[PDB]
A = this chain, B = another copy of it.
Amino acid sequence: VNTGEVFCSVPGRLSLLSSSKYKVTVGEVQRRLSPPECLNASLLGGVLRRAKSKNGGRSLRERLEKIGLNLAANVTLLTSLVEGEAVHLARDFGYICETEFPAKAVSEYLNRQHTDPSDLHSRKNMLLATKQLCKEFTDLLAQDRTPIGNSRPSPILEPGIQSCLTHFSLITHGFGAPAICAALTALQNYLTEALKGMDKMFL
């Protein structure tokens, strides 16, 4: 089984701009057919946005077996996504959290709810603790080396933890771990703004 090879190209479900299709590799098609999802011919046909013909299902089965693959789980909106588009969606969400999440207004509002000056050393220490533990957590997700798109990198994480992050990448088509890092960026920017804000209170 040659997994670097391109199976097909798929227009995006979330494109507003006439200007790309995403490449889907044999590796990706094999990730969809294997556990934990074990997609069938009908669902794989929708992911690949194939025209649902009566020929189409035998045609796809023929295309699959020629390259050494053959044919349930809870289907979500994420199940519809090719890995290219899942990764792109996570990247846009990441960009929006960094640039548009009102981390400053949120810190001003939540700091003002803890304006007892005895509760000030306490809050500074809890903010610093939260920042640290969130970094450890996003550092682990950045060490994820699950195969996605054309990449099949070598693991740095121990096999056990890697296989648990691999399970969560497979059920989310690669959206999960980067969407969580996107959300923890908004939390980290709030904590940073809350610390700057605490230090203005201290005066």
Contacts and interface: CB of A to CB of B under 8 A. Distances in A.
Interface of A: 12-18, 43, 46-47, 52, 75-81, 85, 88-89, 92-93, 95-97, 100-102, 105-106, 108-110, 113-114, 125-127, 129-130, 132-134, 136-137, 140, 157-158, 160-161, 164-165, 167-168, 171-172, 175-176, 179-180, 182-184, 186-187, 190-191
6 contacts: A78-B89, A97-B180, A102-B165, A106-B140, A180-B183, A180-B187
Given A109-B157, A126-B133, 9 more contacts: A14-B78, A18-B52, A77-B92, A96-B171, A96-B172, A109-B140, A110-B136, A113-B136, A184-B187
Contacts of A97: 176, 180
A192 to B, nearest CB: 13
A200 to B, nearest CB: 17
A175 B113 CA distance: 26
A16 B80 CA distance: 6
Contacts of A18: 52
Nearest to A194: B133
A77 B106 contact: no
Contact of A168 (B85, B102, B165): B102
- The number of times this chain is found in the oligomer is 2
Contacts of A158: 109
B106 A161 contact: yes
A187 to B, nearest CB: 6
A16 B75 CA distance: 8
Given A89-B77, A110-B137, A167 B15 contact: no
A194 to B, nearest CB: 9
A140 to B, nearest CB: 6
Nearest to A12: B77
